[PDB]
Amino acid sequence: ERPSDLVVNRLVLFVVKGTATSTHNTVKPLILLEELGVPHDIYVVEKVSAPWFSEINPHKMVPAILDRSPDGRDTLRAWQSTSTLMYIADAYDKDGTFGGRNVQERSEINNWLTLHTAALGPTAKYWLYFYKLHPEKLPKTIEKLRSNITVQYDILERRLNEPGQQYLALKDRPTIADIATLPFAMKSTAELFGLEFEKWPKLQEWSVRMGEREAVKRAWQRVAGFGHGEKEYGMLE
Amino acid sequence: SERPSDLVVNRLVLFVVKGTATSTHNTVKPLILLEELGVPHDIYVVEKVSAPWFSEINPHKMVPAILDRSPDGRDTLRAWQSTSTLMYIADAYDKDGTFGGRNVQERSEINNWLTLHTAALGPTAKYWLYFYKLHPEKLPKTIEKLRSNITVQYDILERRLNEPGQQYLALKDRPTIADIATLPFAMKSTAELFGLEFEKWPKLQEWSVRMGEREAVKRAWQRVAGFGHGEKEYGMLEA
Ligand SMILES: [Cl-]
Ligand SMILES: [Cl-]
Ligand SMILES: [Cl-]
Ligand SMILES: [Cl-]
């Protein structure tokens, strides 16, 4: 059974209480919702281990989405931050401003999106797990993952050194590839990994360029504050 | 750093390595979809993925990768990462959305189960194989934890395939790029490599057998094993 306050009248983004370590994935779909001006609700999940939430995301993590299908026949779900980006782009990015407008654009967007989804994302997640969650400390495993993060930063730096390549996928504008990468490729996260982010200057410039976008600023502010308003858990008003 | 003499893009070119049990589980993915759709393609066997010319195609220096002509045929584009190669082939060649999804509902579930593989089982299995075989030192505690995480992913797939009428991972009716992406890491042979008894996930095992019976899947496994063992060891194969 779902909580009484969980109703799907529009896109519902599932998050947890905003902390330094709880927002780097939930901010991704929120950035795109803010960029496109998509009507949405915020549901603050008290416990991702709750059976009702496992029915939405079998992987028992945020972010997740419930939304009405375009024809209203189905309640659609998206889970895994990358999948939430793909869903919002599919349902709401009519012009392919962030999703890509042609086969050529989408070929590069999916390259750099999938690089994050398969490489930096999981490497960073395993680094964080072994660094402070695993019951035993495994420094050789932690060091190899931190080494792999620097290899990923090197690739992103190489791309952003290519002539006129202002964003990861497309030269001209940010895409879901850029939104997916940003939280794991900015100064604060680099410092968490014990890295000097200045050693990737084009990647740092890119992170500042992304960070100056009003939609990104709004997303970071809101994700920090979720659960710290008048309501702690459930559907925010 | 120049491209090899025999590398030309007159059609889709799929970059692979010499076929072994542990070199083909990612390259087989786009090859399955190419065989399913009947896409005309060439195979290029990469001798050294560390070669500068190859990093200009895939900066991550791994197979699979694709070079293909743009739709209008005036330009060349690239796809790298097995998941990206599947998304590209579906975009360019699956206009009916038979494997890519025909609407927002279908694509929502396809992208959920495709991304689960791309984010969870795929990277976990990759790190497992790396620490098990490739890493200069053996770290059995790391290896054991990754093996445990594989069983958690198998548990999720098993739950999904136990849902009423859920014959495939994403859609009830037919297999999609989500099923193609998952199969190589969720079959009896791979489960045995990880030191797992695949029978503990009966609906997942039944699903892997159903997928394996598809003629395009049989052709892909048959071909990917042979690449680099024919009359030409490296470079553009003749087909
Ligand atoms: Cl993800
Ligand atoms: Cl996530
Ligand atoms: Cl991938
Ligand atoms: Cl891959």
Q: Give the separation between CA A123 and CA A142, rounded to whole angstroms.
A: 10
Contact A76 B119 (CB under 8 A): no
A161: three-class secondary structure by DSSP: coil
Taking only Cα atoms into account, the Rg of chain B, rounded to an integer number of angstroms, comes to 18
Q: Write out the residues of chain A at the interface with chain B, using a CB-CB cutoff of 8 A.
A: 58-59, 69-70, 73-74, 76-80, 82-83, 86-87, 90-91, 102-104, 106-108, 110-111, 113-115, 117-119, 121-123, 126, 130, 134, 136, 138, 140-141, 144, 155, 158-159
CA of B115 to the centre of ligand 1 (A): 6
Torsion sign, CA atoms B63, B68, B70, B76: positive
Identify the DSSP state of A15. E
Task: Indicate the DSSP class of residue B55.
Answer: H
Distance CA A10, CA A88 (A): 12
Report CA(B85)–ligand 3 centroid distance (Å): 8
Question: Rounded to whole angstroms, what are the CA distances from B150 to B123, B139, B147, B184, B185?
Answer: 10, 17, 5, 13, 9
The rounded distance, in Å, linking the Cα atoms of B230 and B74 is 33
For residues A120 and A180, the answer to whether their CB atoms sit within 8 Å is no
Q: Report d(CA A228, CA A187) in Å as an integer.
A: 25
The alpha carbon of B17 is separated from its chain's Cα centroid by a whole number of angstroms, namely: 13
B112/A140 CB distance under 8 A: no
Three-state SS at A198: helix
Residues of B in contact with A69 (CB under 8 A): 104-105
CA–CA distance, B122 with B128 (Å, rounded to integer): 10
Helix axes A121-128, B122-129, angle to 10 degrees: 70
The reply, when asked if residue B209 is annotated as ligand binding, is no
Q: Say how many C-beta atoms besides its own lie within 10 A of residue B64's C-beta.
A: 25
In a mutagenesis test of the A interface, which of B104, B117, B159 is the best target, namely the one with the most A β-carbons within 10 Å?
B104
Alpha-carbon span A176 to B16, nearest angstrom:
28
Q: Which residue has the tokens 């070119």?
A: B13
3 state DSSP class of A166 = coil
- Classified as helix, coil or strand, A65 is strand
Nearest CA of chain A to the CA of B230: how many Å?
Answer: 31
Query: Does B208 carry a binding-site annotation?
Result: no
Both structure tokens of B27: 């390259």
Indicate the pairing of strand A11-15 with strand A40-44. Answer: parallel
Could you say which of B70, B119, B139 has the minimum Cβ distance to residue A82? B119
Cα torsion angle, A56, B98, A101, A175, sign: positive
Find the CB nearest A126 among B71, B116, B127. B127
Cβ–Cβ under 8 Å, residues A60 and A48: yes
Burial class of residue A206, CB neighbours in 10 A (0-12, 13-18, 19+): buried
Helix and strand numbers (H, E) in chain B are 10, 5
How many Å apart are CA B111 and CA B118, to the nearest integer? 10
Pairwise CB contact (< 8 Å): A58 & B118: no
Dihedral over Cα of A72, A78, A83, A88: its sign: positive
* Residue B43 burial (10 A CB sphere; 0-12, 13-18, 19+): buried
**Which helix (H) or strand (E) element contains residue B108?**
helix B104-116
What is the C-alpha separation between B131 and A120, in angstroms, rounded? 18
Of B92, B119, B156, the CB nearest to A121: B119
Q: Which CA distances in Å does B185 have to A145, B118, B121, B133, B141?
A: 22, 11, 7, 17, 21
Amino acid letter for position A23: T
